[PDB]
């Protein structure tokens, strides 16, 4: 419903910040975090009526999630955790809840200028990755 005009697409990534941290934080075991901190993916997005559809492609892995808006749904992430995702819209802002194992973390991605930024929250840390249009 014009619900991510501005986001379909392909987009590529060019630069990350503070990712090493954030993905301790996460959990994730040492040689995913050294293997996946090289990967630069592309996320391409694509919306078919209330459907989003958001895939990565990248050399450490390819993940897909298709999704509605305020609707519950099974991830399992690229480091191979299995979630519960809830993906809403505020304010612009796509805003995704991660659950498992008693433990969340939130991943916010929003439009600035040409990019899109995508910021990810673990208690107190945070990683930034900023794509660009592929
Ligand atoms: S609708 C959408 C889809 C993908 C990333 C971000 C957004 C958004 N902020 O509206
Ligand atoms: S924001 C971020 C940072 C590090 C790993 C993964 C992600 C993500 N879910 O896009």
Same mark, same amino acid.
Request: glycine fraction near 8%.
């Given at each position: 419903?014009?619900?991510?005009?501005?986001?379909?697409?392909?987009?590529?990534?060019?630069?990350?910040?503070?990712?090493?941290?954030?993905?301790?934080?996460?959990?994730?075991?040492?040689?995913?975090?050294?293997?996946?901190?090289?990967? /630069?993916?592309?996320?391409? =997005?694509?919306?078919? #009526?209330? %459907?989003?559809?958001?895939?990565?492609?990248?050399?450490? &892995?390819? *993940?897909?999630?298709?999704?509605?808006?305020?609707?519950?749904?099974?991830?399992?992430?690229?480091?191979?955790? /299995?979630?519960?995702?809830? =993906?809403?819209?505020? #304010?612009? %802002?796509?805003?995704?809840?991660?659950?498992?194992?008693? &433990?969340? *973390?939130?991943?916010?991605?929003?439009?600035?200028?040409?990019?899109?930024?995508?910021?990810?929250?673990?208690?107190?840390?945070?990683?930034?990755?900023?794509?660009?249009?592929?």
């Amino acid at each position: 419903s014009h619900m991510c005009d501005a986001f379909v697409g392909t987009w590529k990534l060019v630069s990350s910040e503070n990712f090493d941290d954030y993905m301790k934080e996460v959990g994730v075991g040492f040689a995913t975090r050294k293997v996946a901190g090289m990967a /630069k993916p592309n996320m391409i =997005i694509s919306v078919n #009526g209330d %459907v989003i559809t958001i895939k990565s492609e990248s050399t450490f &892995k390819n *993940t897909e999630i298709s999704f509605i808006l305020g609707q519950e749904f099974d991830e399992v992430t690229a480091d191979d955790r /299995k979630v519960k995702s809830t =993906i809403t819209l505020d #304010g612009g %802002v796509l805003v995704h809840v991660q659950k498992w194992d008693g &433990k969340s *973390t939130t991943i916010k991605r929003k439009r600035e200028d040409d990019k899109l930024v995508v910021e990810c929250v673990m208690k107190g840390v945070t990683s930034t990755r900023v794509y660009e249009r592929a």
